[PDB]
Symmetry: D2
Subunit: 472 residues, 4 copies
């Protein structure tokens, strides 16, 4: 029974790290990437926390667990992942692992503790269950101030980017690191196998860091991508609507967007420091050499691509792609360019730990890819499936199928679907849904989507077959 | 088997008519009110079309029929009322009624015809089923024009109020009347009992009429109510959000709101003319003397009360109250001040027509009240129940319980409930939810709400018992 | 809030009493019949304990409560009525009744107590929930002895009829009476309204009584009915199979069947004594003059009609008909010949006691009939609906519709349905299902059955529409 | 896309063949066993046709497909496998296989044809769907004749064993072979990949063969096993009851049981001839060298072990074990002694044929075992899971877990479970369930069963946790 450590981050993009030729020097994450298996084409299940984390920890899609929206936020109907869904936490406990959890959970008050973990520290540790959804009255008021031409301290906009007072040592991130260190120190003194999860709120917006991280990337030198700040042409209406109050970006100057980037980059630099602190502790405690590690982001984050901020009900690569490194100390490092999914994390843990199966596995173990490289998937279609059933109480039913060359997005709450040619239009600027030159590609993607919905027993296949009847 | 005629209107308020001391002379509706049973405290089930109409025609709440949102609109998940829900239409057909339908249906393409009616004319008559939701790209563009300081013809704002070209004879309303006349003429030549439904889109916004109705009420002379144009204090966040694009009323001048009223009043005057035309035809065809008539609005309409336009996920009296007249030619006219519900229409039709029962009746027959007056309900609590599960793809789960003196609104997708003292604050300006002086009233209303949710087997009772635990 | 007493008996036939011109002098029950409302055409919902009692106490059919088989018996899948089904017991407790229960419950261990009653005494009072089904190894062994030509003490067959040692004072029946007396004496000392249920295992087989009841009816003088001991002609196979081990009656002589009658009659004589003891106690305690009383049998019992013993999956009148007397001290006594149902008991209690509604009422209040006589139902079809979904782990799906003149039984687990002309063949000897002279009656009964299944939302309507396609 | 032939037999035991050292010379089946992969410890999913065949063809357990009883038989509630369950038949058709079906289907009228196969010949081919259950009036009458001391032609008992008139050429088996030959001859003329299923009613009882098979095995020379004709000691009551009318074996002499063996052996001899005819046709048509073959029995058959005949709700090896040979022409022959399951057939077909996944796979592909031998399962628990939810309308909920050394049977409709030490008591004579010497084994098997029920999402896990509370 191997020791396992998961380092989970909130809205951490695939592309920022120096090992991906990104703009932030991340030597600790780069070292882990170089020692482990790089999943460079990893895709989340949903660009939203609770659905992505339920999928990650249960290995099933939201229509199977019922966890298909964020919990505890205006105006979601959901409060918690059912206690019948024990997840990898309870499964590991059942075969004698000591499981520990630190930080962001967002699957219901006390959840890790109710499933047998030591919930050492985090927002949800001492909360009562069935609480009222958090309703963003303060964010609403502050975005109205931004629209009225007000700014916060030092001309910042604290619903978007913020200099935190103090130092790294004062941060939530440092507290989570300190609890992670305690978790590792305690594990080293136990005869029981260890499964530890350290889950950081960073780099979730508003993009916030203390000095020196707040000023380490000059906003004036940020390279903005080809899809930055464009008017969306022939995109679905759900990309227009102000779902969360900060999604009104009408007041954002180019300077504001550049600062959103420079603060995000500072947050990634601070995350790199946090990862180094935990890896150094694992080494000092004699756990590192045999430690099976996953580093993953729950989804990405929009920094003004398509004039969007944060996240919402859509399928753009900046949100859909996630960073993923899986380090198995028994394997030679490899780079995997086959697409993989958040649904593949639970089966990988299941194979590592010989977890009992508690039900379906909607994904596949990544061990074959970690052992053999891309050739493990010889003869298989290179696809990923993404869902966006709900955004905080709004129903969308979104499904996307992504190949290396194309993406098809079904928006069943709209009349407008999306079709992107990722080979010629990797920035997803041009919706080709109405372009007859793409009839063969759309037909193929519709067939692949129907097959996936059938495989996972998604009840929206009935509606899909109506909407796409011309292509079946 | 009596002949039955339903005259159904879309967003027709309880209060406009001259028989209710309202500002519009409505002699044809007044005459029907004076000949029939006035339900002066009638309440809709939901301030939204498809849920209210499914409840009206099936006699069950949306959680039982599955019809708990509008159909066919961005971003609802629903397309049609299940064909397993035959409604009063199929039930009447099954015992030998000739059923006819004209006008607005909004329960799925071809629905009345699929349930055995002659669907003589209307939007949904020749539409394919399972169509894509109508997504309001044009309304979105036009509201952006209004926010940019543009206006339409003659300085109007055609997403709010509009002079139609031509005359009454050119209108959808006149076409629906003409088909209603044909329906009555045909019924008079048949030996079979008749059940006819004429369902008008009027007075649904934008508030539109031709001359002379467009100019018959001077906007300068409109009396605006105490809750007109106020800033909402301590109200739920769902009252703030721009659900449909025209809900952005930030560009509306007092003149614009006054014109919304004067065009609405013109629409009610035109409806009165339409009702007269159908009643005169019933008289000319020898059907009127034995004709059992229902005149009802599916819900009201907001004309700037609480600075709200049209409708949305809320429970204010201007939307929740509905006009209702039920004329049984065998009964002396009476005014009923006991509250009644949209759920009471199907059981009243069931008693009139001896319809077979196809399942639960969530309401009660109104015949006892029509026969005896208010004393029929001696010893019963005077309550009404209102739901707002969904608004066009947004989930809210709203429940309201209303007594003559108080209203309690549960907003389970928010942290803020509502409590109104209708005796001291009939305009519902002051939310008393946090006022300890109302602890007894809130406790009583919470107990009444729990009992109603139990009675109708609403699965949200579990969440209710958590949210309201302090008062149970 | 009136005081209510229910006297419930297990397998007590409609016809044994002297007030029904039956063979047993029952002066106490006759007196109650003469003082109350006689429902002389009452019908149980199912000829099996747990389903009948769940229907009685909840007012909903088994497909709605899930309680569609006996609990706790080989080889039923069921253990208890869900605690979400509070029944009239919890509903009465909720409005301030003191509810007390004595004797047979058979709806799950501790059930009356878990729903707020004082469970004073009875088999289920101190039992653990979720116990293993009682499997009749002893009965199996003893019926094998009977088939081998053995007899029990005094030549009796103790799986069919038995002389108990001692006297009435030593019996379970006397203990249940004594607890009933305590219940009434305690109720007389309280100002709180009283709801008491005394539920007797008598006269459930084996038919067992002490002297002098054991020898009170001479077996040689028993009048056997026209359908006694016949070979079943063209009847469904479920009437042939040995479901419970004592259903093998191949070893029964005519003397054994006569003695099963003698002992059944002795048990009815002892029941009449028990009823007298409780009514006399109510009189002595000053409760009788205002006491609202129901006396009912859960179903009948087969004494060799169609060569059947006890009960099983079938719909014969001797099992389907039930005794019912409802005494409302405010009403003149009347005889009701309209059919009524076990589903009508909960709504009658709900009207008497002003119980809150916890859901559907599949039956109707009997107060209108108790007040007006048969004319209350002028213009209603005189039908009863009977179900036999399960017998102790065997699935049958049986439905029967009964009119004063005809009975149609659907046996969906068989190829043979039943059709009886009760006018010309009240003993139900001749199955007319294939007789084209009865095509009009069968068609009418099929239509009535389809209507009833639709009304109660019985999911077997789909299969019914296949099986009866020729008749719809 | 390889060509696939399935040879399926009805109630064919694992042990009769000469390759298993059994009493019948079966050179054709032995040759296939010697050329292919022998699964000598194969286990069916249920000892009943429709459930076993639904599991075989869908790769999911009955609680997932709803196909958990025989269809079309007194007194099952079921008529057909849902057409939403396309099975391997529709999945193979979807990727361009020509699928053909001959013989016994027993999953609903027309089922193979409705799923895209050429249903060449068989009982279900031209039948109407939703027919009334076959009710065994003839068998009931004839078993009554046997109990009255009558015999059939030549002193036979035709509900148990029967000489057919004519020769092999006149048999149903020869017709099924002849259609199988046509299927192979037609497949040889197509370039399209072939998937053929030939499903024989033999050797289902009554055990029936023409000469010379009827007299080939001398009944006087039959070797009877150690568990033949014993009185069952401390066994569950469902083993005693006469579920199907021929289960009354009280009239069977030792000669009658010996002849049931003689005729069963004659039927296996005739099956070996049938298999030879199809394999020889495959060779003559040039298909054999690349033909991927499965030969399997749906379950075994009881020949008087524990004094049982045919099958019923129980888990004895003679019924639970099944013959299985899988021949992949690309692989070296191997004998597999690891247990395998009927749930492993669909995934094996899915791997051979690259079938799309239509949902869960409750089993595993057998290719790794076929390639590597038993070592493929190194470090896996050697278990099999068996269910007996229903027998022809009787509910039993039975679950069995089997290891090489032990078997635990949960009988939730009884108070008696079973525990067999297969090492010391391979004939399953001694129920050890109450033997404290076996507490460790029972505890381990209970844990393994709980894990399996959780893995397949069997809703009976809730009741299992109550019944087995002492052991969890
Ligand atoms: O596999 S595990 O994660 O160890 O958990 C299994 C099973 O998957 C899980 O559903 C169950 O959870 C039970 C279930 O819901 C909540 C919890 O207790 C309740 O009473 C229900 O039995 O726990 C099992 C392992 O115990
Ligand atoms: O009561 S009615 O309105 O006359 O309709 C009843 C019943 O309520 C309704 O559910 C049923 O509808 C059937 C059902 O769904 C659609 C329609 O056909 C399908 O095949 C199903 O049988 O119709 C009955 C009366 O026929
Ligand atoms: O109407 S009552 O008989 O008073 O009971 C109601 C309701 O009908 C009943 O379902 C509920 O039972 C709750 C329910 O299951 C058991 C009990 O507690 C659980 O937690 C569930 O909420 O009790 C109410 C009265 O409170
Ligand atoms: O995978 S397949 O065997 O090819 O079948 C799939 C799917 O698994 C199956 O459920 C579906 O069956 C549809 C479904 O029920 C019957 C049939 O038509 C109905 O309208 C429903 O949509 O068929 C697909 C292949 O198309
Ligand atoms: Ca996130
Ligand atoms: Ca921080
Ligand atoms: Ca599944
Ligand atoms: Ca599927
Ligand atoms: Ca409306
Ligand atoms: Ca109009
Ligand atoms: Ca209901
Ligand atoms: Ca309820
Ligand atoms: Ca009984
Ligand atoms: Ca007794
Ligand atoms: Ca119904
Ligand atoms: Ca079989
Ligand atoms: Ca044959
Ligand atoms: Ca599970």
């Amino acid at each position: 029974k191997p020791n396992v450590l998961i380092l989970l981050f909130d809205d951490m993009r695939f592309d920022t790290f120096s090992y991906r030729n990104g703009p932030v020097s991340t030597p600790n994450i780069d070292a882990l990437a170089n020692e482990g298996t790089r999943f460079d084409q990893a895709m989340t299940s949903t660009g939203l926390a609770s659905p992505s984390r339920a999928a990650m920890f249960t290995g099933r899609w939201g229509h199977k667990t019922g966890l298909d929206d964020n919990v505890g936020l205006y105006h979601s109907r959901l409060s918690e992942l059912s206690l019948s869904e024990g997840s990898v936490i309870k499964r590991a406990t059942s075969i004698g692992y000591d499981v520990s959890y630190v930080g962001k959970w967002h699957l219901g008050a006390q959840g890790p503790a109710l499933r047998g973990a030591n919930f050492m520290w985090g927002h949800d540790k001492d909360e009562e269950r069935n609480g009222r959804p958090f309703t963003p009255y303060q964010t609403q008021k502050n975005v109205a101030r931004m629209n009225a031409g007000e700014r916060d301290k030092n001309g910042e906009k604290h619903d978007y980017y913020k200099t935190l007072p103090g130092t790294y040592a004062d941060t939530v991130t440092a507290k989570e690191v300190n609890e992670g260190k305690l978790m590792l120190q305690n594990a080293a003194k136990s005869d029981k196998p260890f499964f530890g999860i350290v889950s950081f709120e960073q780099p979730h917006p508003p993009y916030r860091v203390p000095e020196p991280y707040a000023s380490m990337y000059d906003y004036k030198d940020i390279k903005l991508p080809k899809n930055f700040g464009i008017k969306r042409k022939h995109k679905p209406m759900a990309q227009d609507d102000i779902w969360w109050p900060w999604h009104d970006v009408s007041h954002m100057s180019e300077t504001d967007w550049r600062k959103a980037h420079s603060f995000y980059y500072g947050a990634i630099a601070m995350i790199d420091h946090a990862v180094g602190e935990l890896i150094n502790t694992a080494k000092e405690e004699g756990l590192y050499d045999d430690l099976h590690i996953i580093l993953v982001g729950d989804q990405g984050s929009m920094l003004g691509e398509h004039n969007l901020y944060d996240k919402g009900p859509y399928a753009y690569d900046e949100l859909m792609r996630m960073p993923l490194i899986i380090r198995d100390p028994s394997l030679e490092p490899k780079i995997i360019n086959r697409q993989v999914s958040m649904l593949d994390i639970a089966p990988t843990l299941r194979q590592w730990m010989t977890l009992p199966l508690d039900g379906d596995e909607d994904g596949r173990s990544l061990l074959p890819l970690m052992k053999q490289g891309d050739s493990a998937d010889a003869g298989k279609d290179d696809i990923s499936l993404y869902a966006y059933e709900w955004y905080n109480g709004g129903w969308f039913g979104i499904r996307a199928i992504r190949t290396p060359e194309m993406k098809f997005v079904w928006n069943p709450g709209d009349s407008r679907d999306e079709l992107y040619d990722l080979k010629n239009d990797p920035y997803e600027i041009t919706n080709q849904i109405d372009n007859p030159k793409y009839k063969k590609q759309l037909t193929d993607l519709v067939h692949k989507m129907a097959g996936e919905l059938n495989r996972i027993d998604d009840p929206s296949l009935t509606k899909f077959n109506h909407h796409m009847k011309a292509f079946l």
